Nucleic acid binder design. Structure first.
Lengths: 247, 247
DNA sequence: CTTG
DNA sequence: GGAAG
DNA sequence: CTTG
DNA sequence: GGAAG
């Protein structure tokens, strides 16, 4: 089956991803920015116990590390959500290169009606952050019944950061450039972590999907085996139902 | 003096005006209009005693007369103010021909710096209403301590009627047409009931003002002797101060 | 009085 | 709510 | 939690 | 006030 043939490509069997070909990202600040340190709002025990196993898993994975940083933004409550709005304001803008889904789907011709849809799991976390940029994203973590108060920060591209979708989309485009060159018959649409492969025949779509999964896993990305729509005539992609070249 | 030389022209000495050359006005209705009868809101004794001497004076002058009309609009409280909004909605629109004061003053050249300013008193009441149009403006009048409940209406162009300023301005323009032809040296600005005469010299402005007062009184209009600004180098007209050709 |  | 009729 |  | 981080 598809799960056994590509253990590296699926998040279920391949471990947390890491885009090994992508250099750790440096995040340039605006010309006048200085660090901002926002105090952590006290959070209830209920919220803290809910967040704690997530933080611990991220620490175990090396996605969070301890730090001391002049930057600090608050965590809110369960799973942690960081309010990065004051960091976002101080980070230099980049051109938005992610196409809107309407325009992205215009590149889907009627000759290609066999579809494979993959969604990458924990996509942003596959991209490393350069150590010089890690302090930007620090937050406070308290363990009252352990007695650890200090900051943690991210070693990977974080959720809530304004440039994460664009930086991820650009990174994956670099990493799939050769796949496109090696498979000029296939149509590959990329929308951040949502991928559509289109082919002429079931065999072609089958062979391309095998190549794409092999490529994604080798590069360090991980797709959701549970959500994958593999070699179907009808798929759901980006909120559309793709059927008979329609929509 | 100016008051003794032109007794007919001044409201103080000439009686209520009546534009004897102007035919009684017929007020056309919109194509779909039918009469509207709005109930008179009960008014306090204090308001009624305040309004009463005004109504009685207008009755004595023949400006109000008794009637029975399918139209009725309310009086509000002291001096009476009629709410003619529902009549105004049913009366056919006319082109607004009264110039705005800014544009009206553009016709004042610097060669004419001697001014006379007159304001006509009770101007609208100088224009008669045709008996066919009188019922349009009816209202209810109650005298509880006399025991008279019934309608009255206007025999002259009423306050609060949307076309009164334009109809009056057009009427006075017809009546002063010959004065303009007989005095081509003078500048005469008309803004409804507010008149400015301009001349080159004090003698000219003096002679023109004598002619204008004689003409106005003969036609049945009445100017306020108290407010008149006669043959001055500096006058207030339409909210402006006219001095040295400025403003 | 009702209709920024 | 105050400007208007 | 703050920021038609 | 609820959509966002």
């Amino acid at each position: 089956t598809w799960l056994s043939d590509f253990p590296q490509a699926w998040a279920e069997t391949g471990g947390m991803g890491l885009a090994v070909r992508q250099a750790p990202l440096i995040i340039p600040l605006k010309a006048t920015s200085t660090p901002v340190s926002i105090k952590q709002y006290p959070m209830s025990q209920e919220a803290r116990l809910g967040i704690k196993p997530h933080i611990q898993r991220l620490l175990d994975q090396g996605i969070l590390v301890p730090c001391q940083s002049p930057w600090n933004t608050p965590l809110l409550p369960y799973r942690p959500v960081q309010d990065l709005r004051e960091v976002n304001k101080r980070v230099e803008d980049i051109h938005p290169t992610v196409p809107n889904p309407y325009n992205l789907l215009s590149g889907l011709p009627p000759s290609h009606q066999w579809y494979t849809v993959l969604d990458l799991k924990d996509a942003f976390f596959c991209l490393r952050l350069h150590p010089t940029s890690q302090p930007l994203f620090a937050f406070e973590w308290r363990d009252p019944e352990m007695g650890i108060s200090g900051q943690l920060t991210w070693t990977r591209l974080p959720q809530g950061f304004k440039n994460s979708p664009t930086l991820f989309d650009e990174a994956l485009h670099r990493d799939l450039a050769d796949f496109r060159i090696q498979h000029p018959d296939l149509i590959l649409l990329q929308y951040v972590d949502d991928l559509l492969l289109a082919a002429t025949s079931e065999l072609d779509c089958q062979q391309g999907t095998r190549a794409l999964l092999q490529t994604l896993g080798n590069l360090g990305y991980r797709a959701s085996a549970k959500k994958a729509q593999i070699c179907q005539k009808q798929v759901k992609y980006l909120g559309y139902l793709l059927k008979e070249g329609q929509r």
